């Protein structure tokens, strides 16, 4: 379906499909799954960061960025475009704080970055970003927020979302949760469980779980999950995986 | 985007500019405009192609454009490109007048407009101006002049030339009938009517289908006067009498 | 201050200029030529602030020569004068104005002799005779007293020598030698310098 | 439907004078899968859109098509979501700039014309594609009363007594035409009745209150208001009793 | 001041179906006459003239640029310009340089090319039109021009009396101004002829 | 800032064994008027450095915004490396020099104090980009009034304890309140240690006026 | 962001700008528009056949005033007509600011034609898909012009453009003379529209504008009712 | 602004746009130039012999300066552009360096301009080849050509345009120390070179001559006819 | 220059003198200073005559284009906002002192726009050189919701006070009565001053002026 109308994001297919954006989405669904779940007191991210060669250091090619003092960012797809969008989000938050004098609401940061990525879905001189990403923040006066932005540029709030190869399975297993009533200390455990379930040990041999939450436990600061809590979460996930 | 680029300003494998050639075909299908250089004047005769009787023809002329105090031009080709070119010609003539406080020599104005056309066939990717013009003028250097211009930016000083539909036949007739340095204004007008008779074969050459303007010098002032309907009718009737007399 | 003078006869334009180039209480040069041959029948006598004069004269000279090469016919003295005025007036309100006082002498086959006067503001004026510098004040009275429209070239030279003698007698600055050129239908002719 | 050259790829004329990219943009509007219905009455304007929640993990508060342009103008967007958000951001900017430059609030027709001019620019130039989204603006004019306006990718705008856009705009248009021809002096209640009835009879759903969105403006209350679940449920109950 | 560098003097006066424009002919530098035949009144049509006074360089630049614009306007529209449209054109040209203004105050004097109703106006150096029914003057001796014109102008004059009045006004005004004078040129624009004639003035 | 509008007066600083201490009063004066009486002129740039600024409080606020955002971005990177007090001093010097070169000076004279890697840092930077390090720094009228006492203490005793440094700063600020027309009684004291940056205030200095009865 | 810099309109091997032909095809596929120059005015008429009763006829207009004495109507793509109307209003205002005189209708037509020419040759743009009929009264004489997508403007005494424009032109050619007053011109324009109108033509499905010594004005629906009843 | 790369390297390393400009040159009128002892001669073929034309306006030999002049083969308008820039550069060099331009300097300028159009974005190469002749200040005659590729060489005699190869072979066989002994011999050599390709003698020859300390001179048709007659007698024997 | 405006029961009465000066010497005796901004809005002009003329013309063209686009009567607030923003942009270098008044859908509105961009919405505003006298007359006699004739007489008195007590104002009084239903441009409303009748005869007989050269140029 294409071969004549899929050469530029500035071209509509006879049935009104911008095929370049769909190919960017195809790119992002061929990447390791990153999940995020929103609970009462924050949002916990999780990444099945594959290790392509063991020559890399633990922590190479992080997919859990930190775009502002209170906003995290999980990414899937092309990592170069993910880092570029992370810098765009960082610049947007910085400009917001400089002009309006307070922290950017995530409902606005998501909109700004989504419009930035939408600007690349219109012109033949540029190409759509090949990365869908999640943003998560918690502030006492606005609560926990979780948003997804895809290559098209659509932003929606999620009580839990998955991006990558195993989006469907991860969402199916997330729905079994009751995240609206749970806390971060348990949501991290369940995020590890979900990542280990959706991972396949036969096609992609090895991966390291990269976790990070932002919430009341961390005073709104988005931090990588402490090493001991990550060890406990992986221990639970492995025991559950039996 | 290279996919959609028409590559207007590039060379052909055989070394020719297709866009200029296509514009020249367009001009060759356009209205006939011929000019004849006489000893005491120079005239432009132009076939009008829009003859429909619901036209008003408010302006000074429909083909002949006054470029400055001492010069005029005609057009064969696209009318809108003609309008932009004639505006540019007026700007160039007035820029010389401002810079030197004297009228622009005709060849300089032709050269400037032709340089602009060359620019449009050299760089920028824009399509050329599909307009061939036919200049008539006077200056204190070379007297009465007649100039042709091409979309490629070429120009030539002509003593009798025709641009437009049936241009080759008109050029052949002019070559046969033009008398060197011995052609007065009335002789040139008669020759123009005769040439337009064999050029507008289908239209039978009524006086409503031709626009004639003469550039002469009177008391040190150049006068560019579009021939009236009455006197174009007189020219046509005289040519008809001469054609009938040829049978005798 | 430098000196220029021009006398337009029936068939010539006689122009003279001092040859002193002083940049202090001392005269650095005594054979300075402040006349620029813009064409075979045009002379631009340029004085004014240093640096501006040579640059502006050479600019107008380049443009006149370019016109000659590009068209095959020379600019008339009237056309060259108007071009010079246009350039000076355009640069009047620019960031780099030219402070030059000008005399443009020329001959044309039809217009005949022409003498043009331009101040540093670019105010053009065709005059039978003109002068620049503080010596104009001393010499223009003599020009008014003795000039007639049908003056011959020998009488014009005599009148010009009267002006230069007046400068030598009642003017503080020491201008010993003056260049003398005449533009006739044959072109620009170098006459002997008037010295003292 | 002849074709020569790139007329199906960039916005240049087909031999019959048709711009195929614009029609493909209309197909893109259809691609959203949703339909929207707007109808104006004696002293009110109502926009009702189809609210679908494909996944229970979404925050339904963040999945909306009714957007508040200004304090007095509403907007329902049908088509590609990112393009619709771009268009609503542009409409907000134009309205705010109108207030800043001219000192009075923008009329609905003026805003629709500005957005339609931007759309025309899209359908004139060749490097950007048209936005595959349709805007239906509503508001109360000081002199002319309720306003319902629509702008499509072609750059066309017009005021409507009642209109619709989306996957089922033809059936909804026919139904609203049959209701308009009667001219039975619409009130606020009757306007919301006819909007919801049109949407339901065209989609054959019989909505519960959470499957639609209603946004209203009124002469008494010119404020744009997005009806909550209670009001929509009350109107639906009013439908049921009849 | 900058206007008194080269002097200058122009006035215009209305009559009955005829209009007058007058100017001095002196070009000088603050004390020193250079030429006695400077052109300060320029023809902008068959029956329309503009008279520039002020800085000589700006006089010439404005006249030439206005001729530029007017020639382009006439060619594009195919009609001789109306005097009111000429005044608007001059106002726009002089307001383009509002912060670098040409130091000229033009006077426009002509007849409607369809009605032949006389028109006189003046503009300031930054483009403020002033259409009067009696007389407009501009120059470094404007006060004398006002005095003479107010004492002399009478409505509905024939071209003879119009010429006499403008001539006496200009002559006696420039005789009391040191930097303007050395001959006076007057044009009497009429329905079917222009008569330009030069006066016998004081040359001191 | 070609001319200042609301200016802060002297800001002090003395190194000691384990960090530095900087004190500045809480006043922003509009010329002679003491307009804003409880404004803080000490910034905690990060866990290791602090910044007290004299001069225009608007330019100080702008520079506080820029430095805070820079530290926020640094923390966002989360790669272990952090801005040393030396790095903050160098960046501040470059910014002020760039602003003088554009003839738009930041009308502040600033004291940067820090404690990183077991070394105490006290830094100076003015609107013209003059920068240096000294055991004790005083700005404005503090340089004439407070700095002599600081130097006469640190020349005899090169290294001071925390309590000795605090007492010396309190005495110097008392002298400044005595003999500076633009001083205010209320002030803050900020100290950097291994523990971080702690700002104490609003402190007030006790004053003696027993020479009032002597004067007649 | 940067647009294309090459002409989308180029000369075909036949020696003809096919894009202008296709724009003229779009013009010929639009709603009919007619213009008749009376001795004391000129009438501009076009049909407003909305495709449902839902459209508010008073919301958008096809006969748009430009100055107090110039109006225009089109036959083609409405959005391009809106763009050209805005540009023509800008040009008229610029002329008024320069010359303090209402812009001559011929000058406005020339400037609009220049804009059309620009879009014929400029880079990355397609020609306008509208032919305009610019009407105006100035210099004590009515005017009527037609500007094709290429930017070529023709002075006309009576013309029809859009669907059945050749048959409408034949109609006008048969039934137009010099001495027509404005009322006769309005009647003849309504008949010319009727010649191609499908179904009953009413007040809201035609839009008629006139310009005379009093200036240009759209005819209100009541006046159109009065003129329609006269048939 | 347009920034497409019109001239790009093709496989086998050819710049097709330059080759196409050279092909356009090959279709231009034949131009011949010969360097003599004390005279330099340029000659061009006139296929445009048509008698209703003003000969002044289609001259293919233009004076770049008082001491430099050129003749071209290829597109006429590109030649006009290059000639105008060459004249501007001549006058600029005369202002800045006080002296008249040497032939090689303006040849280098023209070659550099053509090469820049060969390699710059969004413009085609000049479809003209030139023959830049003239005299240096030291009185040494010169003759150069500038092909569309931008390469300039010095030639004792050369031909550009159609029949360049034929006229080049003729010049190779007929350029000796004796054939340029006098001015008339050089004139006749150039005319004989043209006669190898022109349809009819005299009427289809434009011939300009430049000698020391004299401007370019356009030989009138009568002089061309008398010269051609002299070659006719010389060929009879 | 003296320009005054007042809000009466049904609209705006705008007044202005007709004297323009270049220094202490009068240049124009019948200059028009109530400018046309739109059919419902007029602007009195003070300050630099060229500046006020050009700003009023530009805003009138902008407002005409705006009205054509919107198909509505221009609003006075719109003209005020354009004028104040454009004057602020020029930072006082456009010395346009203006009294803006007009009647729109929201009712009568009177504005006083200063060169630097300041605007004062007031029931009565006086600007110009003779603003003090007009403002004194206003403060003495202005009462809210006056009838048409009373407001017209008040503005006439204010402009007259500007004329007779300021050397930079005089030679006539112009009024503009803007109401919901009608516009009245009274030029001139009163003529409080008139040049006296010339007593002596100074007519120049033909032949008085000596002519050196002459050239007749006959025309069509
Ligand atoms: K497009």
Distance G120 CA to ligand 1 centre (A): 16
Give yes or no for a contact between F70 and F83, defined as CB atoms under 8 angstroms apart.
yes
CA distance from start to end of chain F: 45
Q: Where are the alpha helices (DSSP H) in chain B?
A: 18-28, 79-100, 106-120, 167-177, 185-199, 229-247
Give yes or no for a contact between F184 and F27, defined as CB atoms under 8 angstroms apart.
yes
- In this complex, is the C-beta atom of C71 within 8 Å of any C-beta atom belonging to chain B? yes
Q: Do I78 and D107 touch (CB under 8 A)?
A: no
Using DSSP's 3-state secondary structure scheme, residue G58 falls into coil
Q: Please list the residues that pair with I43 across neighbouring strands.
A: I35, I100
Give yes or no for a contact between G191 and G231, defined as CB atoms under 8 angstroms apart.
yes
Tell me, in Å, the resolution of the deposited structure.
3.2
Which DSSP string do the residues of A26-64 spell out, in sequence order? HHHTTS--EEEEEETTEEEEEEEEE-S-TTS-TTTT--E
Nearest residue to D50 (alpha-carbon basis) of D168, D162, D188 = D168
Vertex G105 angle, CA G101 and G111, to 5°: 95
Query: Hey, what are C58's tokens?
Result: 């050479």
Alpha-carbon distance C113 to C127, whole Å? Answer: 11
Give the domain ranges of chain B.
18-247
Measure A67 CA to nearest chain F CA, in Å.
7
Question: 10 Å Cβ neighbour count for C174?
Answer: 13
Query: Hey, what are C62's tokens?
Result: 């380049």
Q: Does domain B18-247 have CATH number 3.60.20.10?
A: yes
Element (H, E) at G77: none
Q: Do A171 and D55 touch (CB under 8 A)?
A: yes
Distance D83 CA to ligand 1 centre (A): 14
Give the domain ranges of chain A.
1-242
Alpha-carbon distance A116 to A85, whole Å? Answer: 9
**CA dihedral of C87, C89, C95, C99, whole degrees rounded to 10:** 90
Using DSSP's 3-state secondary structure scheme, residue B195 falls into helix
Select the residue of H4, H22, H54 nearest B2 (Cβ to Cβ): H4
Select the residue of E29, E38, E100 nearest C119 (Cβ to Cβ): E29
| Torsions phi, psi for A171 (to 5 deg) | -65, -40
- In this complex, is the C-beta atom of E65 within 8 Å of any C-beta atom belonging to chain B? yes
Alpha-carbon distance B59 to B81, whole Å? Answer: 19
**CA dihedral of G184, G190, G193, G199, whole degrees rounded to 10:** -150
Whole-angstrom CA distances from C46 to C15, C16, C37 are 12, 11, 11
The third-level CATH classification (topology) of the domain covering G11-230 is 3.60.20
Alpha-carbon distance H111 to H105, whole Å? Answer: 10
HSE toward the beta carbon, residue D95, CA cutoff 13 A = 23
Give yes or no for a contact between E40 and E32, defined as CB atoms under 8 angstroms apart.
no
Burial of D29 (0-12, 13-18, 19+ CB in 10 A): buried
Helices I49-70, G78-99: crossing angle, 10 deg rounding: 160
Give yes or no for a contact between B145 and B106, defined as CB atoms under 8 angstroms apart.
yes
- Closest alpha carbon within chain G to D152: G79
Select the residue of E91, E130, E143 nearest I20 (Cβ to Cβ): E130
Vertex A178 angle, CA A177 and A183, to 5°: 105
Question: 10 Å Cβ neighbour count for G115?
Answer: 18
Give yes or no for a contact between D94 and D115, defined as CB atoms under 8 angstroms apart.
yes
Helices A184-198, A167-175: crossing angle, 10 deg rounding: 140
Burial of A58 (0-12, 13-18, 19+ CB in 10 A): exposed
Residues 6+ apart with CB under 8 A from C154: none
Element (H, E) at G26: helix G18-28
Q: Identify the domain containing residue H201 by its residue range.
A: 9-236
- In this complex, is the C-beta atom of H69 within 8 Å of any C-beta atom belonging to chain C? no
Residues 6+ apart with CB under 8 A from A209: A46, A47, A48, A49, A192, A195, A196, A230, A233, A234, A237
Ligand 1 ion: Cβ-proximal residues, 5 Å cutoff? D 11
Burial of D183 (0-12, 13-18, 19+ CB in 10 A): exposed
Give yes or no for a contact between D166 and D32, defined as CB atoms under 8 angstroms apart.
yes
Nearest residue to E92 (alpha-carbon basis) of I54, G93, F151 = I54
Q: Which own/partner contact pairs does B95-100 have at CB distance under 8 Å and 24+ positions apart?
A: B95/E68, B97/B68, B97/E67, B97/E68, B97/E71, B98/C86, B98/E64, B98/E65, B98/E67, B98/E68, B99/C82, B99/C83, B99/C86, B100/C75, B100/C79, B100/C82, B100/C83, B100/C86
Alpha-carbon distance G19 to D17, whole Å? Answer: 9
Which DSSP string do the residues of chain I spell out, in sequence order? -EEEEEEETTEEEEEE---EESSSSEEESS---EEEEETTEEEEEEESHHHHHHHHHHHHHHHHHHHHHHTSPPPHHHHHHHHHHHHHHHTT-S-EEEEEEEEETTEEEEEEE-TTS-EEE-SEEEEETTHHHHHHHHHHH--SS--HHHHHHHHHHHHHHHHHH-TT--S-EEEEEEESS-EEEEEEEE----PPPP-S-----TT-S-EEEEEEEE--
Give yes or no for a contact between D56 and A175, defined as CB atoms under 8 angstroms apart.
yes
Residues 6+ apart with CB under 8 A from H5: H121, H122
Distance B174 CA to ligand 1 centre (A): 51
Those chains having 3 or more beta-carbon pairs within 8 angstroms of chain D are: A, B, G, I
Q: Do D110 and I105 touch (CB under 8 A)?
A: no
Give yes or no for a contact between E29 and C132, defined as CB atoms under 8 angstroms apart.
no
Alpha-carbon distance G79 to D155, whole Å? Answer: 5
Give yes or no for a contact between A177 and A37, defined as CB atoms under 8 angstroms apart.
yes
Burial of H45 (0-12, 13-18, 19+ CB in 10 A): buried
HSE toward the beta carbon, residue F212, CA cutoff 13 A = 5
Which DSSP string do the residues of chain C spell out, in sequence order? ---EEEEE-SS-EEEEEE--EESSSSEEESS---EEEEETTEEEEEEESTTHHHHHHHHHHHHHHHHHHHHSSPPPHHHHHHHHHHHHHHHHTSSS---EEEEEEEEETTTEEEEEEE-TT--EEE-SEEEESTHHHHHHHHHHHH--TT--HHHHHHHHHHHHHHHHHH-SS----EEEEEEETTEEEEEEEE--
Alpha-carbon distance C72 to D211, whole Å? Answer: 86
Alpha-carbon distance E177 to E166, whole Å? Answer: 17
- In this complex, is the C-beta atom of G89 within 8 Å of any C-beta atom belonging to chain I? yes
Give yes or no for a contact between B133 and B73, defined as CB atoms under 8 angstroms apart.
yes
Give yes or no for a contact between I104 and I73, defined as CB atoms under 8 angstroms apart.
yes
Residues of H in contact with G5 (CB under 8 A): 1-3, 122
Going H36 to H40 to H45 to H46, the CA torsion angle's sign is negative
Structural domains of chain H, count = 1
Going I45 to I50 to I55 to I57, the CA torsion angle's sign is positive
Whole-angstrom CA distances from D35 to D198, F103, H126 are 11, 60, 59
HSE toward the beta carbon, residue B229, CA cutoff 13 A = 4
Burial of F147 (0-12, 13-18, 19+ CB in 10 A): buried
Question: Mutate which of H77, H85, H119, H160 to disrupt the B interface (most B C-beta within 10 Å)?
Answer: H77
- Closest alpha carbon within chain D to B1: D127
Give yes or no for a contact between I86 and I58, defined as CB atoms under 8 angstroms apart.
yes
Residues 6+ apart with CB under 8 A from G90: I65
Give yes or no for a contact between D185 and D42, defined as CB atoms under 8 angstroms apart.
yes
Q: Please list the residues that pair with G158 across neighbouring strands.
A: G36
Q: Please list the residues that pair with E35 across neighbouring strands.
A: E27
Nearest residue to D188 (alpha-carbon basis) of D57, D40, D11 = D40
Using DSSP's 3-state secondary structure scheme, residue D107 falls into coil
One of 3.40.50.720, 3.60.20.10, 3.40.50.2300, 3.40.50.170 is the CATH number of I3-190, namely 3.60.20.10
Question: Edge-to-edge strands of the sheet including A155-157?
Answer: A64-68, A71-77, A131-139, A143-149, A155-157
Residues 6+ apart with CB under 8 A from B45: B33, B34, B35, B36, B192, B193, B195, B196, B210, B211, B212
Using DSSP's 3-state secondary structure scheme, residue B142 falls into coil
Nearest residue to G144 (alpha-carbon basis) of G174, G183, G175, G185 = G185
Give yes or no for a contact between A74 and A134, defined as CB atoms under 8 angstroms apart.
yes
Our answer to whether residue I1 is catalytic in this structure is yes
Q: Where are the alpha helices (DSSP H) in H37-163?
A: 76-97, 103-119
In a domain, H179, yes or no: yes
Give the domain ranges of chain F.
1-216
Query: Hey, what are B197's tokens?
Result: 């008779």
Question: 10 Å Cβ neighbour count for D95?
Answer: 23
Q: Do strands F19-25 and F186-192 pair parallel, antiparallel, or not at all (unpaired)?
A: antiparallel
Give the domain ranges of chain E.
1-204
- In this complex, is the C-beta atom of D102 within 8 Å of any C-beta atom belonging to chain I? yes
Residues of E in contact with G108 (CB under 8 A): none
Alpha-carbon distance I97 to I99, whole Å? Answer: 7
Residues of G in contact with B25 (CB under 8 A): 11, 14-15
Q: Do B121 and H77 touch (CB under 8 A)?
A: yes
How was this structure obtained?
cryo-EM
Q: Is the peptide bond before C90 cis (omega within 30 degrees of 0)?
A: no
Query: Hey, what are F94's tokens?
Result: 């470059």
């Amino acid at each position: 379906i294409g071969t004549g109308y899929d050469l530029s994001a500035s071209t509509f297919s006879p049935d009104g499909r911008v095929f370049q954006v769909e190919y960017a989405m195809k790119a992002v669904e061929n990447s390791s799954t990153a999940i995020g779940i929103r609970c009462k007191d924050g949002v916990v991210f999780g990444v099945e960061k594959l290790v392509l060669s063991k020559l890399y250091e633990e922590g190479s090619n992080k997919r859990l960025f930190n775009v502002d003092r209170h906003v995290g960012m999980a990414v899937a797809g092309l990592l170069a475009d993910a880092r570029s969008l992370a810098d765009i989000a960082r610049e947007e938050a910085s400009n917001f704080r400089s002009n309006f004098g307070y922290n950017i609401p995530l409902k606005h940061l998501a909109d700004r970055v989504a419009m930035y990525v939408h600007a690349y879905t219109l012109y033949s001189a540029v190409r759509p970003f090949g990365c869908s990403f999640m943003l998560g923040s918690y502030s006492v006066n606005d609560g926990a927020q979780l948003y997804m932005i895809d290559p098209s540029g659509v932003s929606y709030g999620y009580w839990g979302c998955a991006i990558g190869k195993a989006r469907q399975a991860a969402k199916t297993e997330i729905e079994k949760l009751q995240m609206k009533e749970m806390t971060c200390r348990d949501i991290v455990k369940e995020v590890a469980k979900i990542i280990y379930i959706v991972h396949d040990e036969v096609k992609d041999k090895a991966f390291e779980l990269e976790l990070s939450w932002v919430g009341e436990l961390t005073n709104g600061r988005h931090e990588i999950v402490p090493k001991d809590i990550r060890e406990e979460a992986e221990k639970y996930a492995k025991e559950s995986l039996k | 985007s290279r996919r959609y680029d028409s590559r207007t300003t590039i060379f052909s494998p055989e070394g020719r500019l297709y866009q200029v050639e296509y514009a020249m075909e367009a001009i060759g299908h356009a209205g006939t405009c011929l000019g004849i250089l006489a000893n005491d004047g120079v005239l432009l005769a132009a076939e009008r192609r829009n003859i429909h009787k619901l036209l008003d023809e408010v302006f000074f002329s429909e083909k002949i454009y006054k470029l400055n105090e001492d010069m005029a031009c005609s057009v064969a080709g696209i009318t809108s490109d003609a309008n932009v070119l004639t505006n540019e010609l007026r700007l160039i003539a007035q820029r010389y007048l401002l810079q030197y406080q004297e009228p622009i020599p005709c060849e300089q104005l032709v050269t400037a407009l032709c340089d602009i056309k060359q620019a449009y066939t050299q760089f920028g990717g824009k399509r050329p101006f599909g307009v061939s013009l036919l200049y008539i003028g006077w200056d204190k250097h070379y007297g009465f002049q007649l100039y042709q211009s091409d979309p490629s930016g070429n120009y030539g000083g002509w003593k009798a030339t025709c641009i437009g539909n049936n241009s080759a036949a008109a050029v052949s007739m002019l070559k046969q009938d033009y008398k060197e340095g011995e052609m007065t204004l009335k002789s040139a007008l008669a020759l123009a009517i005769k040439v337009l008779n064999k050029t507008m074969d289908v239209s039978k050459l009524s006086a409503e289908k031709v626009e004639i303007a003469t550039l002469t010098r009177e008391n040190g002032k150049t006068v560019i006067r579009v021939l009236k309907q009455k006197e174009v009718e007189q020219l046509i009737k005289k040519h008809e009498e001469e054609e009938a007399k040829a049978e005798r | 201050m430098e000196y220029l003078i021009g006398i337009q006869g029936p068939d010539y334009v006689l122009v003279a200029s001092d040859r002193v180039a002083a940049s202090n209480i001392v005269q650095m040069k005594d054979d300075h030529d402040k006349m620029f041959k813009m064409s075979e029948k045009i002379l631009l006598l340029c004085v004014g602030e240093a640096g501006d004069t040579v640059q502006f004269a050479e600019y107008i000279q380049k443009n006149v020569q370019l016109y000659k090469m590009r068209n095959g016919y020379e600019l008339s003295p009237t056309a060259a004068a108007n071009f010079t005025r246009r350039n000076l007036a355009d640069c009047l309100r620019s960031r780099t104005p030219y402070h030059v006082n000008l005399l443009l002498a020329g001959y044309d086959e039809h217009e005949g002799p022409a003498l043009y006067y331009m101040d540093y503001l670019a105010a053009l004026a065709k005059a039978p005779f003109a002068a620049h510098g503080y010596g104009a004040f001393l010499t223009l009275s003599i020009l008014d007293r003795y000039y007639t429209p049908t003056i011959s070239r020998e009488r014009a030279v005599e009148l010009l020598r009267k002006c230069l003698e007046e400068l030598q007698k009642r003017f503080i600055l020491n201008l010993p030698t003056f260049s003398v050129r005449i533009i006739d239908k044959n072109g620009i002719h170098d006459l002997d310098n008037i010295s003292f | 439907g002849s074709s020569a050259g790139f007329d199906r790829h960039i916005t240049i004329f087909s031999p019959e004078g048709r711009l195929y990219q614009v029609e493909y943009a209309f197909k893109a509007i259809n691609q959203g899968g949703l339909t929207s219905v707007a109808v104006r009455g004696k002293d009110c304007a109502v926009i009702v859109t189809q609210k679908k929640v494909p996944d229970k993990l979404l925050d339904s508060s963040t999945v909306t098509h009714l957007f508040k342009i200004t304090e007095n103008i509403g907007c329902v967007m049908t088509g590609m979501t990112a393009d619709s958000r771009s268009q609503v951001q542009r409409a907000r900017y134009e309205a705010a700039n109108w207030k800043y430059k001219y000192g009075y609030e923008i009329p609905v027709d003026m805003l629709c014309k500005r957005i339609a001019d931007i759309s025309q620019v899209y359908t004139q130039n060749a490097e950007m594609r048209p936005l595959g989204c349709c805007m239906i603006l509503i508001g109360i004019d000081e002199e002319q009363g309720p306003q319902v306006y629509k702008c499509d990718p072609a750059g066309y705008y017009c005021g409507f007594k009642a209109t619709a856009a989306g996957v089922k705009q033809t059936e909804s248009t026919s139904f609203l035409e049959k209701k308009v021809k009667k001219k039975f002096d619409w009130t606020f209640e009757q306007t919301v009745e006819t909007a919801i009835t049109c949407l339901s009879t065209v989609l054959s759903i019989d909505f519960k209150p959470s499957e639609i969105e209603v946004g209203v403006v009124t002469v008494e209350n010119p404020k744009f208001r997005i009806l909550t679940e209670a009001e929509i449920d009350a109107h639906l109950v009013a439908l049921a009793e009849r | 001041s900058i206007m008194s560098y080269n002097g200058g003097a122009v006035m215009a006066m209305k009559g009955k179906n005829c209009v007058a424009i007058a100017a001095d002919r002196r070009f000088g530098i603050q004390a020193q006459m250079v030429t006695t035949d400077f052109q300060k009144i320029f023809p902008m049509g068959d029956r329309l003239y503009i008279g520039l006074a002020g800085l000589a360089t700006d006089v010439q630049t404005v006249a030439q640029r206005l001729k530029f614009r007017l020639n382009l306007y006439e060619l594009k529209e195919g009609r001789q310009i109306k005097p009111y449209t000429l005044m608007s054109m001059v106002a726009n040209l002089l307001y383009e340089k509002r912060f670098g203004p040409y130091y000229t105050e033009p006077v426009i004097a002509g007849l409607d090319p369809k009605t032949f109703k006389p028109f006189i106006c003046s503009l300031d150096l930054i483009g403020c039109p002033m259409v009067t029914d009696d007389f407009v003057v501009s120059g470094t001796c404007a006060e004398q021009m006002y005095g003479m014109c107010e004492s002399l102008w009478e409505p509905n004059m024939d071209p003879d009396h119009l010429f006499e009045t403008i001539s006496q006004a200009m002559l006696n005004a420039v005789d009391r101004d040191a930097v303007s004078g050395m001959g006076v040129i007057v044009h009497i624009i009429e329905k079917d002829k222009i008569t330009t004639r030069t006066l016998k003035a004081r040359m001191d | 800032t070609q001319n200042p509008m609301v200016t802060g007066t002297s800001v002090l600083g003395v190194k000691f064994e384990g960090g530095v201490v900087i004190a500045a009063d809480m006043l922003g004066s509009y010329g002679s008027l003491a307009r804003f009486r409880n404004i803080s002129r000490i910034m905690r740039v990060n866990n290791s450095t602090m910044l007290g600024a004299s001069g225009d409080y608007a330019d100080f606020q702008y520079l506080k915004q820029v430095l805070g955002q820079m530290v926020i971005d640094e923390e966002l990177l989360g790669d272990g490396h952090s801005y040393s007090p030396r790095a903050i001093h160098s960046w501040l010097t470059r910014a002020m020099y760039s602003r003088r070169s554009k003839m738009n000076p930041l009308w502040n004279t600033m004291v940067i104090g820090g404690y990183a890697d077991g070394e105490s840092f006290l830094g100076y930077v003015d609107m013209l980009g003059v920068a240096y390090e000294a055991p004790s720094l005083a700005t404005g009228y503090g340089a004439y009034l407070a700095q002599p006492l600081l130097r006469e203490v640190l020349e005899k005793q090169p290294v001071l304890s925390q309590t000795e440094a605090r007492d010396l700063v309190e005495r110097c600020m008392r002298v400044l309140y005595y003999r500076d027309a633009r001083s205010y009684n209320r002030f803050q004291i900020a100290t950097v240690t291994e523990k971080g940056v702690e700002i104490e205030g609003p402190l007030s200095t006790e004053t003696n006026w027993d020479i009032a009865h002597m004067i007649s | 962001e940067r647009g294309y810099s090459f002409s989308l309109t180029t000369f075909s091997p036949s020696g003809k700008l096919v894009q202008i032909e296709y724009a003229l095809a779009a013009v010929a596929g639009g709603a009919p528009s007619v213009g008749i120059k009376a001795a004391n005015g000129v009438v501009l008429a076009t049909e407003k056949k909305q495709k449902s009763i839902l459209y508010d006829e008073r919301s958008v207009h096809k006969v748009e005033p430009i100055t107090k004495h110039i109006g225009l109507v089109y036959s083609g793509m409405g959005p391009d007509y809106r763009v050209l109307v805005h540009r023509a209003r800008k040009l008229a205002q610029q002329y008024y600011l320069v010359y303090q005189e209402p812009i001559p209708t011929a000058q406005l037509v020339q400037r609009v034609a220049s804009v059309m020419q620009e879009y014929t040759q400029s880079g990355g743009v397609r020609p306008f898909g509208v032919s305009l009929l610019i009407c105006g009264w100035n210099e004590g004489r009515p005017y009527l012009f037609q500007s094709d997508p290429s930017g070529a403007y023709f002075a006309w005494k009576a013309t029809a453009m859009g669907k059945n424009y050749v048959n409408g032109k034949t109609f006008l050619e048969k039934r137009y003379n010099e001495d027509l007053e404005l009322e006769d011109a309005i009647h003849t324009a309504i008949l010319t529209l009727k010649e191609s109108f499908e179904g009953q033509m009413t007040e809201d499905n035609i839009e008629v504008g006139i310009c005379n010594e009093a200036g240009f004005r759209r005819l209100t629906p009541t006046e159109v009712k009065d003129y329609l009843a006269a048939i | 602004s347009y920034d497409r790369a019109i001239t790009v390297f093709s496989p086998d390393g050819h710049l097709f746009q330059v080759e196409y400009a050279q092909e356009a040159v090959k279709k231009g009128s034949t131009a011949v130039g010969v360097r003599g002892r004390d005279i330099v001669v340029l000659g061009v073929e006139k296929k445009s012999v048509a008698k209703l034309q003003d000969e002044r306006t289609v001259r293919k030999i233009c004076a770049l300066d008082d001491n430099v002049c050129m003749a071209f083969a290829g597109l006429t308008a590109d030649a006009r552009i290059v000639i105008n820039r060459a004249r501007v550069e001549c006058q600029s060099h005369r202002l800045t360096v006080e002296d008249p331009v040497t032939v090689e300097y303006i040849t280098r300028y023209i070659a550099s301009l053509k090469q820049r159009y060969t390699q710059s974005n969004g413009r085609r190469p000049f479809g003209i080849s030139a023959l830049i002749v003239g005299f240096d200040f030291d009185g040494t005659p010169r003759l150069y050509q500038t092909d569309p590729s931008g390469t300039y060489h010095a030639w004792k005699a050369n031909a550009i345009g159609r029949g360049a190869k034929s006229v080049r072979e003729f010049l190779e066989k007929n350029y000796t120390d004796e054939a340029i002994e006098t001015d008339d011999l050089t004139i006749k050599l150039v005319i004989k070179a043209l006669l190898e390709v022109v349809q009819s003698g005299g009427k289809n020859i434009e011939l300009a001559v430049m000698r020391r300390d004299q401007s370019l001179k356009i030989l009138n048709p009568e002089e061309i006819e008398k010269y051609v007659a002299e070659i006719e007698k010389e060929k009879e024997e | 220059t003296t320009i005054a405006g007042v809000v009466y029961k049904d609209g705006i009465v705008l007044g202005a003198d007709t004297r323009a000066t270049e220094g202490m010497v009068v240049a124009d005796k019948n200059c028009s200073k109530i400018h046309f901004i739109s059919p419902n809005i007029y602007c009195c002009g003070a300050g630099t005559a060229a500046d006020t003329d050009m700003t009023t013309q530009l805003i009138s063209s902008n407002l005409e284009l705006h009205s054509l686009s919107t198909g509505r009567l221009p609003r006075v607030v719109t003209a005020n906002r354009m004028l104040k923003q454009m004057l602020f942009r020029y930072q006082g270098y456009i010395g346009a002192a203006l009294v803006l008044g007009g009647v729109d859908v929201t009712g009568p509105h009177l504005y006083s726009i200063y060169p630097h961009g300041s605007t004062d919405k007031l029931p009565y505003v006086t600007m110009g050189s003779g603003s003090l006298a007009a403002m004194a007359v206003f403060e003495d006699k202005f009462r809210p919701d006056m009838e048409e004739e009373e407001a017209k007489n008040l503005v006439s008195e204010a402009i007259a006070a500007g004329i007779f007590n300021d050397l930079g104002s005089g030679s006539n009084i112009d009024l503009c009565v803007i109401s919901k239903n009608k516009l009245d441009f009274l030029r001139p409303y009163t003529v409080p001053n008139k040049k006296g009748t010339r007593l002596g005869r100074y007519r120049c007989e033909k032949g008085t002026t000596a002519v050196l050269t002459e050239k007749i140029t006959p025309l069509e």
